[PDB]
Design a binder for this molecule. Structure first.
Ligand code: RTO
Length: 496
């Protein structure tokens, strides 16, 4: 019954305004880190370095396009092919330095650029799990303080990485910390705020991430060099670590632990901050106990064990994997469209704003399932048509990728509501975590799929498209939730 107490000590008041602003400010740089490698790893045009002894036309084989071939140089001077031992010359017009230029992650080692994104995301999957356990054991706040320090240290050390294995290690650790920031952000804010506003928070947090995409575009234009851009995007988290010491730990986590002494201390401190001091003094242990006694979940396995909840698990896992796998596939590949990588990031960021509305409108009106078939099928049709339409077309390809990314942003928003209303109260938090875990598996698998570009230039896109088209067909199986009350038991779910 914490909700009741939550409204005695000011409800939303100075403490919630101050702390929530501060706890959601870091998220503005989650987008900057997740998709940083579009700018820190951009691939400049590379052609082989002519042999040093020789004093480009004569030393470079030309492809059909008539541009110098990237991975080959002539063995002997041809007037009017060996792999390149002497290195590559990279165009410096757009990208002064990138991890690709620094470590020659080009030609045979091209897959390494994507391995690094996959490793960062392996870190994000690991961090959601490690830090989720650690938060329940050490506190939402203590785990946040340590996560701000880890992102700052790991990201700074990645910027000063001397070799590629080390950059990848510090990028996995950066992601582990960031996964814990994104989780503990929600928990600390949601638990210190009213229950009814469990979605507005899910929204401000959602839009604060989208604004992060414009932040990456503006920051990357200003600081093109990768070591400098990685340092700039990670140095803010040392400042976050310094003020995070003044956060107030969730009183709800304190009550759950068994320490009502700290629930009382937090509630009184907040009453001083919100200005309702008299009302806080009234709060004692005879009151807090009785009014928090009723409050005082099922194992994840159950999702698999019950046939009813296994069907809802499998179906939703395909929906969460597909949306993430496709979304990262599209968001990762900003260079191919033929427009500046900065304008495309700004555009891609913008779409999320009219998308989320159009989504809200179709979801609250038509249904929660028709919106998921439409958001995923249309994204799949757009991505597969980006694959088929010839590159020459930049506007037709850019417009279709932009619509597709907007549709996958809508799918993210719907799959959150859809997944919280489909599950019964007992397994609803486990189920939203498993769904988010499958989303993170999608992000790990997506860069690995992109490595198939070598096999065929359009194979990466044909998969990033076919998977959402298949997920859309899976939504047919799931049950409509519009106008139906949330289920409380498996039987309840079965009934409706
Ligand atoms: C909670 C898991 C989802 N994630 C992907 C897995 C790492 S995420 O990076 O947090 C993300 C991505 C995209 C959008 C959006 O466009 O709405 C919001 C959040």
């Amino acid at each position: 019954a914490f909700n009741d107490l939550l409204q005695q000590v000011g409800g939303v008041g100075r403490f919630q305004q101050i702390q929530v602003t501060l706890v959601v400010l870091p998220l503005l740089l989650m987008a900057s880190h997740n998709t940083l490698q579009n700018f820190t790893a951009a691939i400049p045009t590379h052609h082989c370095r002519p042999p040093a002894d020789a004093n480009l036309e004569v030393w470079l084989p030309r492809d059909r396009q008539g541009q110098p071939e990237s991975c080959l140089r002539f063995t002997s001077p041809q007037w009017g092919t060996e792999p390149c031992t002497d290195g590559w010359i990279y165009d410096n017009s757009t990208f002064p330095s990138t991890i690709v230029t620094e470590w020659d992650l080009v030609c045979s080692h091209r897959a390494l650029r994507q391995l690094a994104q996959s490793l960062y995301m392996v870190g994000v999957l690991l961090g959601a799990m490690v830090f989720g356990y650690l938060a329940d054991r050490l506190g939402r706040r203590k785990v946040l303080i340590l996560n701000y320090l880890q992102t700052a240290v790991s990201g700074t050390c990645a910027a000063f990485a001397p070799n590629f294995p080390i950059y990848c290690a510090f990028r996995l650790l950066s992601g582990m910390a960031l996964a814990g920031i994104s989780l503990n952000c929600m928990t600390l804010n949601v638990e210190w705020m009213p229950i009814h506003t469990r979605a507005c928070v899910g929204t401000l947090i959602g839009y604060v991430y989208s604004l992060g995409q414009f932040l990456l575009a503006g920051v990357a234009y200003a600081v093109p060099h990768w070591r400098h851009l990685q340092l700039l995007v990670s140095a803010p988290f040392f400042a976050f670590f310094i003020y995070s010491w003044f956060f107030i730990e969730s009183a709800r986590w304190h009550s759950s632990s068994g320490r009502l002494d700290l629930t009382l201390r937090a509630l009184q401190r907040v009453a001083r901050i919100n200005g309702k001091r008299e009302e806080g003094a009234k709060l004692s242990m005879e009151v807090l106990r009785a009014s928090l006694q009723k409050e005082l979940q099922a194992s994840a396995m159950e999702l698999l064990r019950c046939p009813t909840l296994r069907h809802l698990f499998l179906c939703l896992s395909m929906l969460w994997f597909a949306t993430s796998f496709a979304y990262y596939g599209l968001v990762m590949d900003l260079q191919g469209f033929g427009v500046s990588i900065y304008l495309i990031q700004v555009i891609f960021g913008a779409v999320d704003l009219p998308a989320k509305l159009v989504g809200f409108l179709v979801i609250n009106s038509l249904g929660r399932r028709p919106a998921q078939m439409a958001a995923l099928l249309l994204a799949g049709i757009c991505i597969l048509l980006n694959g088929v339409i010839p590159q020459d077309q930049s506007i037709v390809r850019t417009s279709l990728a932009v619509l597709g990314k907007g549709c996958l942003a809508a799918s993210f928003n719907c799959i959150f509501l859809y997944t919280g209303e489909l599950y019964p109260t007992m397994i609803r938090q486990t189920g939203m975590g498993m769904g988010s875990t499958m989303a993170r598996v999608g992000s790990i698998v997506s860069p690995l799929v992109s490595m198939t570009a070598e096999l065929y230039p359009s194979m990466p896109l044909f998969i990033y498209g076919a998977v959402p088209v298949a997920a859309s067909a899976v939504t047919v199986l799931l049950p409509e939730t519009l106008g139906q009350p949330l289920p409380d038991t498996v039987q309840d779910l079965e009934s409706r």
